[PDB]
């Protein structure tokens, strides 16, 4: 009920979607002074200034990465590794973190919801959603976080499939 | 008043649009297993599962056919060969179907509306629309049928604008 | 207020926006039989018997321009060559002129403001925008009009943004 | 409606039907003591008296002017070219006349009404009417005219056809 209007209102003005003829197949992340976009989502960036800018690529972690200027690093997403198990917030309702992994219930997903990041309690970004496997009745995410050291770690289940 | 309700409710989920940069410019049909869709129409299909296909193309008869998995064949349009004179139910309300030929008041007909499949009194589909003539204050279709054999017949008035 | 709004009435009939891929950036005006569009802004006119024509080009005014067919020829602005001292119209609210420069309250003019035709207090139009710059608490624009022997003039501040 | 019974009172006398087969293709007009009669229009006039006339041809300005016996010289139109902007008096309604262009709304117009003269608010003709184009929601039209050097003028539109 709120969580979905909490998201709306913190996902406003930073979410951006990608769009392909018309078509909204992704959505960029702007957190850090850094823009996320992942590799298989392809198109233009709906923002005029983001548009108009080299991203460099890392096809291992499977992201693109710029720099934002710094009249719009203020206006960014909250970011930390301080996370413990149990609920957090995402933009269909509720995801399960458990033994290090995030898992969300079936109904939900398919092609084009890339790219939307994890929200926590206090509205810090956790992970961002890059793919996502069946598994059983509850599905399982393959995302990208972070941690104390500082090595952003690429979390990946077997077969999945990239939305 | 509830024809255009009916034709709304039948086909609903078994009709898909095809896009061009956000224009609809034409209708894909899904009977019998099979996929129809025309020449002149050019665009991307709506639905994900349909466009990852690889549709033969009979450029006489003016048509794309495909072969549409199991898994949605009972989710199809009727089809029949018995047909009647007299009275048939289109999107735009009713078409007259006399000496056999298909005719439509004037008032209605643009470029877009191609595709759309002719349905009876039962909901059986026994035309598809592909093109039309201005013929005085009544307008005539050119379209593809069939019959008692088995040959799909392509009926075809003079000089024709297609849709 | 009150001015606005015939202006909008207007402008829904004859003020034509350009198409970009996703947002308007910029307006084609149609006035005394001769189609008007700004070189900088780069997309497609609505209409598709405004998009057809092939546009002659002035460099030296920003402006490209084609012939408007027969049947549009009535329905076209107006244009004055007089013009005193004081308040003319605008889409978005108020416009000085005063010692030949019209000139904006700040805060609104942006990226797609581009080709909306300055009014009068007939309905005529006296100038089209085509950028400006911020004046200190107040913005002065760079627009091209006409004169009394029926030249086109154009007039620009000091290092004006092209909308 | 008060102007056109105005318009119909001065045609009532001063107006003659050119009958080809009893049906009507033009207006003879007797104004300033001269009969005018156009080319193409093709039958006889209505009175007996100018009937048995030897109407001079003039072919550039489409015109077949005579002379009027001395008996008919006061039931003749009187006429002048001042014209200021504003409305004249047709016969059917009214007509615009703005930067040199008598306009009438759509609609109107056809083949048999060429001749027709158009009436000020004295009652004096301004013009005589040959021929038009309908530029969509407002038909110029071809006239002839005078003007104060004392010299026939006629004006032509592009395209126009015949009445």
Same mark, same amino acid.
């Given at each position: 009920g709120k969580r979905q209007r909490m998201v709306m209102k913190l996902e406003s003005d930073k979410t951006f979607p990608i769009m392909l003829e018309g078509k909204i197949n992704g959505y960029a992340c702007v957190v850090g002074g850094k823009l996320?976009?992942?590799?298989? #989502?392809?198109?233009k960036i709906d923002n005029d200034v983001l548009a108009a800018l080299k991203?460099? /690529?890392?096809? /291992? !972690?499977?992201?693109? !990465? +710029?720099? #934002?200027?710094?009249?719009?690093?203020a206006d960014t997403f909250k970011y930390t590794h301080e996370?413990?198990?149990?609920?957090?917030?995402?933009?269909?309702?509720? #995801?399960?973190?458990?033994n290090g992994r995030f898992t969300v219930p079936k109904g939900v997903? +398919? /092609?084009?919801?890339?790219?939307?990041?994890?929200?926590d309690n206090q509205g810090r #970004?956790? +992970?961002?959603v890059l793919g996502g496997v069946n598994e059983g009745s509850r599905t399982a995410l393959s995302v990208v976080m972070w941690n104390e050291k500082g090595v952003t770690v690429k979390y990946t289940p077997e077969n999945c499939e990239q939305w």
């Amino acid at each position: 009920g709120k969580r979905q209007r909490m998201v709306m209102k913190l996902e406003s003005d930073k979410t951006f979607p990608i769009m392909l003829e018309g078509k909204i197949n992704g959505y960029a992340c702007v957190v850090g002074g850094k823009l996320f976009r992942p590799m298989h #989502v392809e198109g233009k960036i709906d923002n005029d200034v983001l548009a108009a800018l080299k991203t460099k /690529k890392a096809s /291992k !972690y499977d992201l693109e !990465y +710029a720099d #934002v200027p710094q009249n719009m690093r203020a206006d960014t997403f909250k970011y930390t590794h301080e996370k413990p198990q149990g609920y957090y917030s995402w933009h269909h309702g509720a #995801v399960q973190y458990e033994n290090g992994r995030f898992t969300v219930p079936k109904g939900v997903g +398919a /092609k084009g919801d890339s790219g939307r990041p994890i929200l926590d309690n206090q509205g810090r #970004v956790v +992970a961002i959603v890059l793919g996502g496997v069946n598994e059983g009745s509850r599905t399982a995410l393959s995302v990208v976080m972070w941690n104390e050291k500082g090595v952003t770690v690429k979390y990946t289940p077997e077969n999945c499939e990239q939305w």
